[PDB]
Design a protein around this nucleic acid. Structure first.
Lengths: 218, 990, 416
DNA sequence: GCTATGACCATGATTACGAATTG
DNA sequence: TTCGTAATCATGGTCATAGC
């Protein structure tokens, strides 16, 4: 519940204690880039890059990670839509509906489910482009993904080419399965049912599984 | 239309092709585009059972398939190999499919293209215009490479183009970063097709306040304000950072043939691209020859350590000498300065003396032929010269003679007649010069950067990378951009496939292979006598040829877990499998319960691996013989490159026979090869040890008998020699391994040593060895101290040398660059090694006296140094890089940095290189037991001064010093006694 | 990737983890190999008395209800489970049983997959099922189908009580007399109605007794077991030679004994002795004679005989001459499979009833002079291996072993 | 009764991680 | 790959508890 002051925008980061031991060094990896980030307009606003830091890390088991936020109307927290318009959230909601069997749904937030963390590798992107801020966020992604790995048991990566070199990405060998492209040709995402593979992997290390039906909003 | 190939490369779009870059006689560049397919080998029955017909099928013909799986037998009833003779077809298709019964599924498609079409990767070809269709400017399309590349013409000479670049950025405390540190200087060496060589350097003007621009322009430099108004003829150009980056982008986009940079893939090119994108929204674009695919620069990684590569697709080869040096040669250090020092060196003479500078002369009549020319060529841009590996000199004046060079160097007068000169480290502080930036400093850094750029050219010409690339492409059957990118398991597939196709055999592994699982110590370290070196001529290839060890020639493996069955099995083997048709080799058992394992190999028909090794050896011998009588320098370089390539490829077979995923994997073959090699080295070491040479006779300590089976050779140990009868020599054997053997002789006359070495080599080759095992004389070692072949120091005399010749001071294992011990430590180690070498050569030594000498020398020096306390602090000054990537709980180094930061206005970032030492209050006297030493660590700033109530904790430094000393020497018990008496601890020997 | 094969394999791995036994080798090796497969493709993978509580020895009240009573016998406990081989305690050795028992076990497992395992209590080469645990249903089905097959089953008891039941020594003796079974007993297992937890009770007390000596008695072909005789002359039931060798009994002295209502069993040694194994094994061997060696759980002869073992192990009548021996082997067609599929040296090993480890470490210590597939001479090299007197006895009987090896090589060569 | 084995102590020992030899 | 420093463990004793 503490806070840290920054030279550049948003001038202040509020956070949870679970990021404490490493986030300190974060400041001398943020002041060297924030000058060039603010030159161009970004999605989301400068006040919501670090709102994902609120969620604690002492009760999370499996991680879902993206490559880049939505170019338009991003609200900091990933893989969500207040108006439920985006294609990827529709696809994952349909997959979860087919797996669980529930046929009605109008909202689906990955933040509601316990034991999971909705994450993105790059924390910014200018509208009209994709993964255009890799050089600005490379070391931050290093630090944050490695710190997440210290607690999470299973890692799920969405994307084929974006996550093709995750083996050298981290230093601690943890189980990691890569998903398929959200816009892959032939609708390969429709045949994807990786969630029960995630669950059965979480079976083998003797941990409590996760139920996805609570994440649906009716 | 005659062209010579340069490179072959891939397109990675939705439709993929094969690209060939070639040059004609006049200088024109031609690109050819082929369709690239997926290849498959099938049998006739599967070929006729393919409901969708393949795109095209080619009948390979009769082929014989052999199962090469290995089974363990516990008896003497051995099931024979399963061999199947059938018709086989080779099919080509655009798209990838799965075939359930496809063989030869380990060879690449590019190799299939080369072999099936009969195209050498670098041959000169007279193409036919009938099968070529013009699709663009300079790019043609060919769909039938079988007939287009039919004509073969002899090799001719073609021009080439090169670009070498160097970068100099701004830094003050830490490693440069893109966001805060700009680029100051950028130097280029440029070679076009016309053969003219240009050198230029661009300096940014953002740091050279306007008076300095005006002074530089008045001095002769040129200023530009736009991209289009800069000329390569001018040697120095002053511009802005944006214009500099734009010029860099323009230069890197040209269709060169080689862009060579030392560690440029990790730092230089990446910095240029990132800075260019950061300053302006502009990219560097590479375009395909047919102009339908564009890519951006994005350096990507590979694991082999970590290697970096460029994703270009225009045909240019981006080369990094760092990776090539790491793969090709094993060295102590990989610094550019160290590589330059080891590469360029000469024997120079003193021509003048006095004052603070002296004149050095060098010519072909002093050192060798061509060394002085190389030094003179490097000298054209050189600035600092290293002499005696201790003195760094700033060049004042230089000139190049017709067959040599002359320099004047500022150094203290030192009275001898001949020294050695080399190009090495420069005592230049870039960070200091960046703090007070002026015009003179800018010009000096400009010439430093241009020398760095030309150093890549000098190294490239020195290593012969172009001819090596051509030879590797020709032999390995691979594109020129792929020769130095993969391991041994990938370069062996081409010649292996060619051999399999010509001998029409297929090897099949049909079972999931199991997960199956030595250093030699010299008798004594110090010698004080002459050591003759003999070299085995490719021991593993010849032993594989002699034993016919191949996966398909293995009759079987017999195991036994008890001696009764072992004895009956030996009886049955001698009754059923007798020499010379079969050979039986013992191996160490592969399972804990088994006590004996015997592998049987047939010799009726030559195998596959022995044929490959014999071909490689014969080709290397032919190329050496052809090189010996060659006259032209170009032909000599080509032949040397070819023989080097054959030597490299022929020495990778033994490692591949033990690699599980390799194409030549065989457990029993590798074990048998190792066993026979060890048996041979043991036999030679046993027969040489104790040999005597008296009167006109030479006697060996054991019978000259074949250690495998009886032979018709005479086995009389006494051999008549041709040496004078007055000699009385006794020989001993000390060290021996796979590659070489050492023989000790008690004399210091080197002429007698070399003549006896030649005679003994002749006698061993003619009389002792057998079949195709040979040894050759290498050198004579004087004052040899060794722990192993990794770490030793001695004076080397070549075989073709006389007594009045300059020795080679060979010294390796030690680093002299491992930068966390001390400054006193390294210097005093050098002094002690020199002292050891100087009393080693007296002669009247024996063994347990020089240990005492060194022990009391250490005692006296340590007492004097501890008592006087006269050494300055900086001689005990240590370094460490600071980073927060520390595991565990505390790691008190971070805490120490914290109190230093909170106690001092100076602040250390997370990328600095901070200096530390060991300090203790002066009241403590000399201690015996040691404690946790991290508590004694202190950080030293620039303004820190040693206070009167503390002092340097000498004990750790002296303990490390005496530990490395006691790692040397021969005596044992007195060493632990001394170490106990001084420090009360157990030394860690070896 | 999201191949269904991967998820089916992952369920197979979890099932194997739920059915892992440390004693088994094939299943353990396969599971481990799949572990390396997974940790190579996915860079990481998450990876006896379990149903038995403490034994009750003092009287206490039990909850009224339905009780299933089964007597737990004296003997060595061995295990068998699905998808594995025969399982026992500690050593992991094996033994021979005709395949019709294997067929019956296959019927047991495939007819009902809910049965956890089948455990046997072993004694004097008479080998009968005692109890087992079935999760899905009551344990009635397993032994009722066992007795349906033909093998004997224990006299199970079903007692339904509506009030508190006091479990004292006297009522235990009443139940034991109700069993009226002459075989030795050690405890009673009582099973609830609908609970998978298994619980046992043994009532016992300790006293002191005096021994006279230790002799050995016959059980079966070459099978011999020692037994200690008491003051009262009652036959003391020794589990095996391992039981006595860790009991470390001292002759002509009193020792503690766990006395039953009708029995008095010698229990495991609870002292703090410091005498090492060597001189005490020489003492017991010289007390029992030079003709005896410990081949694990029993003893064996050293007698010459020679020819009178093959017919016993070839499962045929008495033979007199090698010629008629090979003629009978030739005419009897069901035999050559055994003699052909199996080697020679180990045949001469099981023909003489020798232990594997001692004999192999003995044979790996001599030199043998042979001729024409026939051993003629042998000589010993190391003496330290002879520190075990059993090694000395085997070396002494090697004279008969040589003739046995020679004659089996003769018959092997003659037949083919 | 002294001499025997459990918890206490360390010299001398191998085994372990760390982090550099990176540029 | 080597070299260095903690940490852990086992072969040299000693003494309090306790048994023939």
């Amino acid at each position: 519940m503490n806070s840290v002051t920054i030279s550049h925008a948003p001038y202040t980061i509020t956070y949870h204690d679970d990021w404490e031991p490493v986030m300190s060094q974060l400041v001398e990896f943020y002041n060297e880039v924030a000058s060039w980030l603010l030159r161009d307009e970004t999605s989301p606003i400068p006040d919501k890059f670090f709102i994902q830091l609120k969620q604690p890390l002492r009760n999370k088991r499996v991680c879902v990670c993206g490559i880049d936020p939505y170019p338009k109307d991003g609200t900091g927290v990933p893989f969500e839509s207040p108006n439920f318009t985006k294609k990827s959230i529709k696809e994952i909601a349909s997959s979860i509906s087919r797996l669980t069997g529930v046929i009605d749904y109008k909202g689906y937030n990955l933040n509601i489910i316990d034991g999971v963390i909705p994450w993105n590798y790059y924390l910014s992107c200018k509208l009209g482009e994709t993964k255009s801020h890799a050089i600005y966020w490379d070391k931050i992604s290093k630090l944050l993904l490695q710190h997440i790995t210290k607690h999470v048991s299973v890692l799920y990566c969405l994307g084929k080419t974006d996550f093709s070199n995750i083996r050298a990405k981290l230093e601690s060998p943890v189980t990691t399965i890569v998903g398929y492209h959200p816009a892959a040709r032939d609708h390969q995402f429709e045949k994807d049912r990786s969630f029960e593979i995630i669950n059965v992997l979480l079976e083998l290390d003797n941990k409590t599984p996760i139920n996805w039906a609570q994440g649906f909003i009716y | 239309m005659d062209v010579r190939c340069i490179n072959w490369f891939e397109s990675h779009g939705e439709n993929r092709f094969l690209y060939l870059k070639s040059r004609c006689r006049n200088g024109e560049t031609v690109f050819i585009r082929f369709p690239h397919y997926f290849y498959y080998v099938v049998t006739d029955e599967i070929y006729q059972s393919l409901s969708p017909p393949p795109f095209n099928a080619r009948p390979m013909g009769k082929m014989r398939t052999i199962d090469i799986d290995e089974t363990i037998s516990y008896n003497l009833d051995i099931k024979d190999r399963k061999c199947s003779v059938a018709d086989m077809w080779l099919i080509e298709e655009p798209k990838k499919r799965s075939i359930q019964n496809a063989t030869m599924d380990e060879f690449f498609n590019i190799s299939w293209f080369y072999i099936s079409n009969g195209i050498s990767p670098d041959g000169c070809y007279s193409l036919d215009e009938q099968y070529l269709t013009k699709i663009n400017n300079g790019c043609y399309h060919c769909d039938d490479p079988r007939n287009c590349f039919a004509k073969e013409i002899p090799r001719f000479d073609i021009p080439r183009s090169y670009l070498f670049l160097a970068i100099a950025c701004h830094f003050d405390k830490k490693f440069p970063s893109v966001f805060i540190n700009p680029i100051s200087h950028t130097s280029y060496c440029y070679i076009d097709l016309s053969g003219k060589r240009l050198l230029f350097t661009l300096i940014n003007e953002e740091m050279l306040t306007e008076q300095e621009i005006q002074e530089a322009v008045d001095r002769g430099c040129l200023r530009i304000q736009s991209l289009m108004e800069m000329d390569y003829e001018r040697e120095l150009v002053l511009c802005s950072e944006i214009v500099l980056l734009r010029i860099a982008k323009q230069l890197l986009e040209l269709t060169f043939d080689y862009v060579v940079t030392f560690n440029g893939h990790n730092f230089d090119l990446r910095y240029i691209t990132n800075r260019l994108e950061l300053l302006t929204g502009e990219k560097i674009i590479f375009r395909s020859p047919d102009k339908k695919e564009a890519v951006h620069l994005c350096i990507y990684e590979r694991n082999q350590n970590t290697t970096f590569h460029v994703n270009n697709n225009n045909g240019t080869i981006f080369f990094d000498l760092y990776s090539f040096i790491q793969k090709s040669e094993k060295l102590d250090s990989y610094k550019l300065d160290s590589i330059s020092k080891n590469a360029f060196s000469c024997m120079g003479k003193v021509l003048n003396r006095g004052v603070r500078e002296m004149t050095f002369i060098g010519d072909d009549t002093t050192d060798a032929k061509g060394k002085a020319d190389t030094f003179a060529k490097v000298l054209t841009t050189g600035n600092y010269v290293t002499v005696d590996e201790d003195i760094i000199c700033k060049v004042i004046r230089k000139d190049i003679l017709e067959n040599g060079f002359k320099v004047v160097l500022s150094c203290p007068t030192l009275p001898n007649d001949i020294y050695k000169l080399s190009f090495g480290k420069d005592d230049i502080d870039l960070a200091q010069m960046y703090k007070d930036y002026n015009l003179n400093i800018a010009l000096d850094m400009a010439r430093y950067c241009i020398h760095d750029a030309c150093l890549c050219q000098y190294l490239w010409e020195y290593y012969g990378v172009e001819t090596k690339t051509d030879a590797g492409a020709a032999t390995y059957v691979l594109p020129q951009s792929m020769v130095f990118e993969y391991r041994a398991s990938t370069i062996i597939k081409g010649p292996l496939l060619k051999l399999l196709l010509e001998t029409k055999t297929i090897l099949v592994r049909s079972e999931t292979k199991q997960k199956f699982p030595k250093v030699f110590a010299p008798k004594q370290k110090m010698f004080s006598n002459n050591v003759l070196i003999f070299d085995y001529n490719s021991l593993y290839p010849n032993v594989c040829i002699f034993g016919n060890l191949s996966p398909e020639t293995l009759v079987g493996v017999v195991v036994s877990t008890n001696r009764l069955e072992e004895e009956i099995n030996n009886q049955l083997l001698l009754q059923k499998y007798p020499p010379p048709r079969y050979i039986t080799v013992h191996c160490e058992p592969r399972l804990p319960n088994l006590i004996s394992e015997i592998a049987i190999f047939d010799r009726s028909i030559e195998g596959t691996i022995p044929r490959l090794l014999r071909t490689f050896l014969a080709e290397r011998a032919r190329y050496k013989k052809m090189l010996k009588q060659a006259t032209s320098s170009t032909e000599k370089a080509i032949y040397d490159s070819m023989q080097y390539t054959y030597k490299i490829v022929a020495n990778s077979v033994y490692g591949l026979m033990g690699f599980r995923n390799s194409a030549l994997y065989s457990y029993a073959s590798a074990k048998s090869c190792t066993s026979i090699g060890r048996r041979m080295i043991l036999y030679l070491e046993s027969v040489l040890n104790g040999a005597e040479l008296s009167n006109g006779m030479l006697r060996f300590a054991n019978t000259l008998s074949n250690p495998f089976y009886m032979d018709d050779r005479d086995i009389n140990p006494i051999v008549k020699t041709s040496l004078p009868i007055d000699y009385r020599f006794r020989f001993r054997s000390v060290y021996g391994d796979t590659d070489s053997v050492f023989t000790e002789i008690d004399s210091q006359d080197v002429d007698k040593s070399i003549e006896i070495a030649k005679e003994l080599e002749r006698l061993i080759n003619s009389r002792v060895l057998f079949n195709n095992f040979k040894i050759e004389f290498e050198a004579v070692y004087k004052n040899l101290i060794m722990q192993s072949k990794k770490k030793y120091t001695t004076m080397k005399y070549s075989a073709s040398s006389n007594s009045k010749s300059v020795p080679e001071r060979i010294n390796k294992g030690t680093s002299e660059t491992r930068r966390d011990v001390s400054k006193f430590h390294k210097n005093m180690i050098k002094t002690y090694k020199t002292r050891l070498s100087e009393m080693l050569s007296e002669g009247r030594m024996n063994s347990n006296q020089v240990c005492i000498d060194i022990l009391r020398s250490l005692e006296t020096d340590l007492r004097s140094e501890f008592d006087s306390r006269s050494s300055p602090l900086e001689l005990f000054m240590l370094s460490r890089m600071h980073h927060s990537n520390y595991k565990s709980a505390d790691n008190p180094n971070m805490y120490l940095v914290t109190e230093y930061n909170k106690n001092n206005p100076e602040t250390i970032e997370l990328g600095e290189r901070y200096y530390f030492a060991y300090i203790c209050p002066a009241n403590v006297p000399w201690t015996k037991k040691l404690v946790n030493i991290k508590t004694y660590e202190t950080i030293i700033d620039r303004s820190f001064k040693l206070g009167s109530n503390q002092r340097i904790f000498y004990e750790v430094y002296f303990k490390r010093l005496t530990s490395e000393i006691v790692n040397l020497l021969d005596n044992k018990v007195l060493c632990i006694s001394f170490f106990q008496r001084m420090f009360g601890s157990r030394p860690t020997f070896y | 990737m999201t191949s269904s094969a991967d998820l089916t394999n992952l369920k197979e791995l979890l099932s194997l983890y739920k059915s892992l036994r440390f004693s088994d080798s094939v299943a353990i090796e396969k599971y481990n190999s799949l572990v390396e497969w997974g940790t190579s493709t996915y860079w990481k993978i998450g990876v006896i008395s379990d149903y038995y509580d403490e034994v009750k020895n003092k009287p206490f009240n039990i909850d009224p209800g339905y009780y299933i009573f089964l007597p737990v016998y004296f003997g060595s406990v061995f295990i068998y489970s699905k998808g594995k081989n025969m399982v026992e305690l500690g050593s992991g050795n094996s033994f021979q049983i005709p395949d019709e028992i294997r067929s019956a076990c296959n019927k047991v497992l495939d007819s009902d997959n809910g049965i956890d395992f089948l455990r046997f209590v072993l004694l004097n080469n008479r080998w009968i099922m005692e109890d087992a645990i079935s999760k899905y249903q009551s344990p009635v089905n397993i032994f009722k189908l066992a007795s349906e097959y033909g093998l004997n089953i224990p006299n199970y008891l079903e007692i339904e009580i509506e009030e508190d039941t006091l479990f004292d020594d006297e009522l235990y003796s009443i139940m034991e007399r109700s069993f009226d079974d002459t075989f030795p007993k050690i405890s009673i297992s009582y099973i609830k109605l609908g609970e998978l937890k298994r619980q046992v009770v043994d009532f016992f007390k300790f006293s002191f007794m005096y021994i006279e000596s230790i002799k050995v008695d016959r059980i079966g072909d070459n099978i011999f077991i020692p037994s200690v005789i008491t003051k009262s002359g009652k036959k003391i039931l020794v589990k095996d030679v391992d039981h006595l060798i860790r009991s470390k009994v001292r002759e002509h002295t009193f020792v503690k004994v766990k006395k039953k209502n009708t029995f008095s069993i010698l229990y495991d040694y609870d002292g703090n002795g410091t005498e090492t194994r060597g001189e005490v094994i020489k003492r017991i061997i010289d007390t029992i004679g030079r003709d005896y060696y410990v081949n694990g759980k029993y003893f064996s002869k050293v007698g010459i005989a020679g020819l009178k073992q093959l017919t016993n192990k070839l499962d045929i009548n008495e033979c007199a001459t090698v010629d008629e021996l090979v003629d009978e082997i030739n005419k009897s067609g069901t035999v050559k499979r055994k003699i052909k599929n199996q080697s020679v040296f180990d045949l001469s090993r099981e023909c003489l009833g020798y232990p594997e480890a001692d004999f192999i470490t003995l044979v790996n210590n001599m030199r043998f002079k042979i001729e024409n597939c026939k051993v003629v001479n042998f000589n010993i090299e190391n003496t330290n291996c002879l520190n075990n007197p059993s090694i000395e006895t085997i070396y002494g009987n090697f004279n008969q072993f040589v003739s046995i090896f020679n004659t089996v090589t003769d018959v092997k060569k003659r037949l083919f």
